[PDB]
């Protein structure tokens, strides 16, 4: 298996497994679970490898090691977003020293998106998103008390992330995946495991 290929393979496996373990996610209708992931897909993967590559210099890390540099962002599959990822997310992340708790929180606000297309349990998913808001607000307040704007600061990288997401004319790393099915068939079967 290729170097970047198995990175992509692991990167998705880790994503889906991450969500499988978010409190209440799997209690939603499986179809909604696919919808939420199929839709949050890019922004979720992006935010993830963005934060993970804060220490990496001039690059994006992917599924341990494999630090993609601009000189082959196209190979990697992050050609459309590379520059902005480093400056609008990686840099800003490092600048505020955004921790793992916060990251997970934002990622969840992204996963629990009620405006997801065709989502059935919109009301449910919304209540879930709103818990994360509470949890995250209190977490900042407790952890970084002398930073009155941190909560909103963290919340405001969500649009930035969205924009970078819109630049992906596909679901990141999907065609590098071993199987050759449909996003939904891949998600669905990956969910049941």
């Amino acid at each position: 298996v290729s170097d970047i290929c198995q990175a992509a393979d692991r990167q998705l496996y880790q994503l889906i497994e991450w969500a499988k373990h978010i409190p209440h996610f799997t209690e939603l209708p499986v179809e909604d679970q696919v919808i939420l992931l199929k839709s949050g897909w890019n922004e979720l993967l992006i935010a993830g490898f963005s934060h993970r590559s804060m220490s990496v210099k001039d690059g994006i890390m992917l599924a341990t090691g494999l630090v993609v540099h601009r000189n082959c962002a196209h190979q990697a599959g992050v050609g459309a977003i590379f520059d902005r990822v480093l400056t609008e997310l990686v840099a800003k992340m490092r600048e505020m020293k955004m921790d793992k708790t916060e990251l997970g929180c934002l990622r969840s606000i992204v996963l629990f998106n009620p405006e997801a297309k065709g989502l059935k349990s919109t009301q449910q998913v919304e209540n879930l998103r709103e818990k994360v808001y509470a949890i995250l607000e209190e977490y900042c307040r407790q952890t970084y008390p002398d930073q009155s704007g941190r909560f909103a600061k963290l919340l405001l990288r969500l649009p930035a992330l969205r924009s970078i997401g819109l630049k992906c004319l596909e679901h990141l790393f999907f065609f590098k995946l071993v199987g050759n099915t449909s996003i939904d068939s891949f998600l669905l079967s990956m969910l049941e495991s």
Binding site: E115, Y133, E137, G149, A152, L156, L166
Partner: protein, 237 residues
């Protein structure tokens, strides 16, 4: 808790919001007395949409300049911020002319536009997304102060390429902080959840603004007249 001299800041934005909300009835006049020889009937819908929107972007620029801190920026950055926020801020303006009952947007020509109106002008694609936003906003019961403060936070969004990004960043913090102060002091429960929900609207703007650009590309493909002012500002060519 408790709002300080953000109170003054809020009166100002809420004032200017109100002030620059509607285009001068003379300009809306020019638009109506422009109908060509027996207008395409679906054109007196499309022309209104694009002509009046020139006025909208202008009003947006008008308000953006009366905002504290905008003058502390260099012309280069002032111009960048303006262009960047235009299509996003436009959606807040439209949302505020949304009629929940008739599910329409009351243009400045007292004409109510609906899924039809826009579909007739050839904008049937995006129309629904627009209406949905209007509905979601109406559902949140976003008031004037929140609306204004919010549009100000958008106008001061440090985008890449800005020369002094750090400065736009710092200025924006003031409005963010005043919105928090305001939302919390409505000493209503949920305050943090409301504040977070208000801010999220900003992520929604990135897709709506993208959609708008997408709509411009298409009108350019179908080769329909997109007012030069709009092409110049949204970089639509």
């Amino acid at each position: 808790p408790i709002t300080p001299e953000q109170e003054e800041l809020i009166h100002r934005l809420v004032y200017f919001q109100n002030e620059y909300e509607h285009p001068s009835p003379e300009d809306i006049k020019r638009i109506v007395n422009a109908a060509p020889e027996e207008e395409n009937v679906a054109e007196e819908r499309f022309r209104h949409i694009t002509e009046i929107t020139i006025l909208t972007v202008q009003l947006i620029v008008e308000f953006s300049k009366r905002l504290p801190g905008f003058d502390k920026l260099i012309r280069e950055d002032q111009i960048a911020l303006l262009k960047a926020c235009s299509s996003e801020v436009m959606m807040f303006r439209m949302a505020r002319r949304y009629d929940a009952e008739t599910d329409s947007i009351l243009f400045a020509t007292n004409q109510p536009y609906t899924r039809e109106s826009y579909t007739v002008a050839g904008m049937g694609d995006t129309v629904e997304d627009l209406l949905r936003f209007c509905r979601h906003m109406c559902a949140m019961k976003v008031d004037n102060a929140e609306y204004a403060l919010l549009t100000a936070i958008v106008i001061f969004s440090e985008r890449p390429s800005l020369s002094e990004g750090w400065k736009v960043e710092k200025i924006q913090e003031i409005y963010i902080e005043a919105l928090k102060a305001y939302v919390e002091n409505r000493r209503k429960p949920y305050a943090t959840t409301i504040f977070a929900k208000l801010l999220s609207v900003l992520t929604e703007l990135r897709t709506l603004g993208n959609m708008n650009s997408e709509t411009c590309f298409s009108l350019k493909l179908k080769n329909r007249k997109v007012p030069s002012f709009l092409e110049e500002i949204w970089d639509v060519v």
